[PDB]
Subunit: 458 residues, 4 copies
């Protein structure tokens, strides 16, 4: 078989992440996983480090401080990330950072080209690598190259906040396949090309033909359930169950990102306690929130605001034996988290914007079907398009969020089971295999032809 | 001929000032029409009836609002939810259910007062985001008259509008109008996109009604502005600026101190130019006229504090003993004085982050001397950017591009400056304020 | 033939009541001040109710009166400066004039109730001008003043622009009483070193003679201990006991004031947990901090800063069954607090400046002598001058505070008993009776001295 | 000729002047000490301002004629703990009565001690038995103690340029007792003012550490210390000549032409929170609000170069001041009038003198200042035929000497605004009476008195004290 070449920013089953999504395809084809090893080095690396683990080969590379600052911390995380989440107020464009972004893409692309074989299928992942296919084409690479964006793709009126948006869209048309999480994301990309006169489910633009499609990432719901049962007796689980002592449990797990709406989430739980005082002392909200991107200033500000809200809300409602919001910056093993979800009565997942959000899907998959919890889900998560059994909320409406918490906490068993079974059927109908197998098959349908009109499958 | 009924948040009167009055007065004068709305005053108890004053041929019907009305209608939902979201600032949005209910209550209270004054054939023209529910309230009172709406600010695309929690109800309210008018095509498509892509409707057919959806970009009177700029060129404030500039080039800005206007990005870009081209230090002056706005809204206090700090930091960095780099003034000036400032300047610097149209951009072009015209540096997120192809268009999130555009504007040769001004001037004469007024009134007479 | 005691204070009913009531009962005296109600128009005369032997003469205030008594000069200039916070002082001339005007209005209302031999006892910084206002109405009675908060040294006092007029006002009192010796010497230093007057412990200044003295306020330690036992079985006490589940308890009770050093306190406990990780999950810090002066911008700033620190620290160290800092904005009945103190192993009292701090004294008095807790106390509290059994700390040194917490938590029974008996003997040697009896006796000596040629 | 006639003066300070900064027209410690260094063939020892990647083995020794400069670099860790940390984040705020800005850290204090000991070890190898050692300012409180532990028996004098706070404030510094103990290792502890030396004596007497006796000598920590005040002055007649000589330089003409007849209020300050710049700006605003006829007729020029930018407290006060400049100018500016001309650039000191002379008012209102020489420099720059008015904070040490100044409490904005208006309206005769009174003070305590008096004490105290 042709090798599958996976390219992502950071090269790695219990831990989720990209590895569990792509590993079987790498193992099947004897493929390669190429990318950055997370290290900073003082001088650029001459060649990639090649480690072979059975059938899969790992090719990693270091980055300089200047690379890290301009490619990752800068343009990716201070321009693309805030804009793609509809936060133009947090965007900071810098010309030298953007040039560093392009330079790193080219450096990575030339390093990969030296490892390529003519029949390799190339699968590039996420916003760090928008230019990667374009860079490969300029090196003469004719292989099929597919792209998958894990985060939202903003509508044109928001994308334009990124100053090189036009060049970025041209770069994306170097991919034979541009995959997105949801239909809305793909429509945003198509709307940009059509409504700006750039081109006309195939897109014809910038002298190429592009397949534009949605491949919403799912999970392995049956494995998650087994893991949640297997870990139900670990010490952290007994610790939390002893602490609740019969109180109902609202559970959240989020990177401490401004995309996750943690402040709105905290204030809405406060609003529910004030409006339904009989809940005071009878429910506990646990928020596990490991820090992320601490070296980006926007993340320091959102973290300080959340800490103040935790202190203010807890000072307002705490009793001598009750902390209303248990806020923890510690990271927990993924299997423990599933057992936390199963124990809980409510999953509270209210991002202001999210490509998909797997926590929402993992929350449903952890539940006991005989006594399942309720998912309260922001309508701005990509997962809202599938999880119809969730209570959908608008996170800018704190009163609506508070009512949904109260409804979730008091919901009779029968409706909890109906909503859970509806959501569970969705997870089984679109598990992680569908994302992998469908994208891999679409890549296998592209021909490595010189005529642009011959590449496309059908 | 049926009289035109103008409905807006504030009721004005002279043509030397701008505002809605200059846009609607001649149609009110032509039709013997009525201007209905709030008199700007706050009352302790709600008024039973509107105050009716007739100034020649036009009738003014005014009413006061209570403190609670003010807090929830004007300060609340309108200015704390609609204004930030419609300007793509989801971080500044604060939705409150009680404020939104008060927004609806005030609209209905105004609507019940208007219905008692109406005639069966009156043409009703409603203006701007404070009054999205107004047509709906009138239909529920049995009003069958033609009712048109014109939105002065942008209409956000569906992914941004959804930040407003009662977004579906508001779009339903907008379909009560026979005409949904917007500044630009992009605004009209965002409204169409919501209805079509959410399966509400299919002219638009939605909520059991038929709605004409169109764009009517507001213009100006470029020949009148040019004349005023010449007539006021010798007023004392104009001489003060001229003598003080003393050969330095002049960059002019006039903006409400709104977070929509990009004042911080604008200041930092001028700093960036001075840092990158040190020869300009002492040779150019940036005048920013920025009267305060909505001072009782906390988000407006924060942007003001941030802008004052930047003025102090930047002037402290580059000022010399006879040179203040950025002259920052919180004063309001007579509109005719502004035209004389615009004409005197070499660059108009108008870089909003989001703006429904921006008439300052159009007024700036119209003031210039065609024998020696200034250059317009204009943000691509202003509605005016769709018409003023002669401007140097910039993305305000790119400080380097803004600084390069300023430097390019300040040095642009006469021949290229004249070509750009003539391109923009022709557009202004093609779509002057008459076109906006006559076309909306003509469409209303067709309902 | 016993003269009435007239008590003048902010509000007429622990607290000030327990300190002065026995003297009011003994003399058939009067307590004068504000009744807690607001009026649309000024009250003509005070409302006079007689409760057995004590008369309560109370007055309403208008919104303008209330504003310039509490909100203005007293709390925006005097309070921050006397607590060494020159950065928080906001002097305003009209506020200061309103401060004098309100004192004069209260004084004119009180003068009409006075008998020529009444003994007048004025309390705290809202009422510095009160004696002056009375003298200008012709009042010759003995008038004593007691300042409950610190008196700053002349270099800090001068931050208050009318510092000279205010000290002249204090010399209208026959007695200027302070919490500690350092406070009275700061007042003496201003008068002596600025050439205003001379000593002879009597001060001769502004043509008057003023007795300058310290009267440190105490408690009733034996009453506090009995109350702690009597309330040891209430539901809130059992709630806390059960929730601790063997964990050690560090207790704090403070108004949310910037003088209380709450931010430094939280960070020192954070530093202690960081440097001694085995304490994580084995000790809990309870901070009861009811809000105070919430409509004042300076107090909102410290409150926001403290909440953020609570959230940051708990986020750093909490476990799924352990909240490191239990921060509560609730107020508790005073008798419940004594039971909380008694249950705890450490009392944590770290003001950056405090006139006395009675919580520190209440904490010690609550303890079981068979198993007593340890007091960790800032040396900038007035109580530090008496409570030598405490672990004294400088709150600007977080490491010292963290070390003292650790030492308090591990201290053997013998040393805890030695330190506790030292603090208890002090409390019994200077209980609240001493403050009352000494000041009243001094007031009776001004009146006696007037009966005889000096 | 094997023998040296005069004992060398060894000046020890945090920063040793080099290059342009040795010139008399620059100011600083150099103009205070150079004549004694030249007279005695002395040495100036201390840090060269540089950061080195590894500690220096020995000092760099440069000779300028008769004077030797012996300097050393500091490591980043040394700099962070000695200079940025304990000196500038603990001592400086506390000694200026800002307990709210003070931040103690044990590791920083240890590095402060370590750096003092390292510097003392390097100096000890250069000393001769009769050298007179003159140590300067709060960075070096421990220096004499470290030298005594190396066996140094020389006369060592200390002069504090900043205030010494009273005991209730000094105690905010956690190692206060140790630091006072260290200060008693000096044969002389010199201060700016009587209030400063009394605060030091108050600490020792009221804490039972020692007693005062035999006229001005303190007996504490087993030593005898002369405690005295030596208020620093200026060269008023040299300042006058510089102000006239530079009256035609381009920056001066630029300012003159831009004012165009408007009155000029002049301030020069490092951007320190001790200098009261926010209160100063807001009081000028209050004057403009209360006296609108002044709008457009007077300009406030504030030259405020940045200082200690890597200390967070300095970043915050700067941000607050920038916001105030922007807000006040937005409120009152006209199209040809900037009310507050706020400049962060540094100017040649002689240019500053020509600015002071041109102005009508010197506006010098620190919340706390050891002395403040700008206030004295302002007086000296004036033309006696038409002199400007000094508006001066009572919390500057110079307030005790400049009796012709208008004294203000900067915590009272209304008084400061009134003083500005009073200064702007003052008739010539009273301006001259006040100016001549201040000028005579400057001439009768010029910079020579500070130097000759301290050097005289160094030449005699330790020896006179050895008499039984
Ligand atoms: O302490 C944590 C936090 C998160 N996760 C995992 O990290 C992923 C988070 O992905 P999601 O789509 O929810 O959001 P993202 O973090 O990618 O924005 C999920 O698989 C979580 O199970 C985890 O294992 N431990
Ligand atoms: O001191 C001022 C400030 C503004 N304007 C006028 O206010 C309008 C500003 O409208 P624009 O469309 O530019 O933006 P908006 O202020 O309506 O958001 C223009 O007609 C300006 O001439 C004025 O006359 N004087
Ligand atoms: O919720 C509370 C808080 C405080 N106190 C009491 O209030 C006093 C606190 O006074 P302290 O002298 O300690 O400081 P102050 O608050 O007067 O500055 C003590 O008697 C406490 O027991 C109380 O009864 N309940
Ligand atoms: O830009 C400036 C600022 C200050 N100075 C000089 O620096 C000293 C300031 O000392 P002062 O005692 O007034 O205060 P300090 O800065 O020492 O605290 C004076 O000699 C001023 O002439 C200077 O030459 N240029
Ligand atoms: Mg105990
Ligand atoms: Mg002068």
């Amino acid at each position: 078989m042709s090798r599958l070449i996976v390219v992502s920013n950071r090269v790695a089953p219990s831990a989720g992440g990209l590895a569990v999504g792509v590993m079987d395809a790498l193992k099947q084809t004897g493929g390669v996983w190429f990318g950055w090893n997370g290290e900073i080095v003082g001088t650029p690396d001459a060649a990639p480090a090649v480690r072979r683990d059975g059938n899969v080969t790992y090719a990693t590379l270091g980055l300089t401080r200047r690379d890290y600052d301009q490619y990752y911390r800068g343009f990716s995380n201070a321009t693309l990330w805030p804009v793609f989440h509809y936060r133009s107020d947090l965007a900071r464009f810098d010309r030298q950072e953007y040039a560093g972004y392009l330079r790193v893409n080219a450096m990575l692309a030339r390093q990969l080209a030296a490892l390529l074989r003519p029949d390799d299928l190339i699968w590039v992942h996420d916003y760090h690598l928008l230019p990667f296919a374009h860079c490969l084409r300029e090196l003469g690479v004719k292989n099929p190259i597919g792209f998958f964006l894990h985060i939202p793709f903003p509508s044109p009126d928001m994308l334009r906040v990124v100053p090189p948006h036009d060049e970025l869209v041209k770069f994306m048309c170097a991919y034979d396949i541009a995959g997105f999480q949801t239909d809305a994301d793909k429509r945003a990309f198509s709307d940009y090309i059509e409504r700006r006169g750039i081109g006309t489910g195939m897109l014809h633009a910038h002298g190429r033909v592009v397949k534009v499609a949605a491949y919403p990432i799912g999970v392995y719901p049956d494995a998650i359930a087994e893991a949640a049962v297997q870990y139900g007796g670990r010490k952290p689980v007994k610790m939390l169950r002893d602490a609740l002592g019969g109180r109902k449990l609202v559970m959240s797990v989020d990177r401490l990102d401004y995309s996750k709406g943690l402040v709105e989430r905290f204030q809405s739980f406060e609003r529910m306690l004030a409006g339904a005082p009989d809940w005071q002392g009878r429910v506990s909200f646990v928020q596990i929130a490991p820090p992320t991107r601490s070296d980006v200033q926007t993340y320091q500000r959102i973290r300080e605001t959340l800490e103040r809200e935790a202190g203010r809300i807890n000072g307002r409602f705490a009793q001598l034996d009750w902390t209303p919001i248990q806020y923890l910056n510690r990271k927990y093993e993924r299997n423990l988290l599933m057992a936390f979800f199963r124990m809980s009565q409510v999953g509270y997942v209210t991002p202001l914007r999210d490509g998909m959000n797997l926590v929402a899907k993992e929350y449903v998959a952890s539940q006991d079907p005989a006594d399942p919890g309720v998912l309260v889900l922001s309508e701005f998560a990509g997962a809202a398009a599938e999880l119809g059994g969730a209570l959908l909320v608008n996170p800018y409406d704190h009163a609506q969020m508070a009512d949904a918490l109260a409804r979730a906490l008091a919901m009779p068993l029968a409706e909890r089971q109906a909503r859970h079974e509806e959501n569970l059927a969705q997870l089984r109908n679109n598990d992680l295999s569908v994302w992998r197998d469908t994208f891999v098959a679409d890549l296998r349908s592209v021909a490595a032809a010189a005529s642009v009109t011959q590449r496309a499958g059908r």
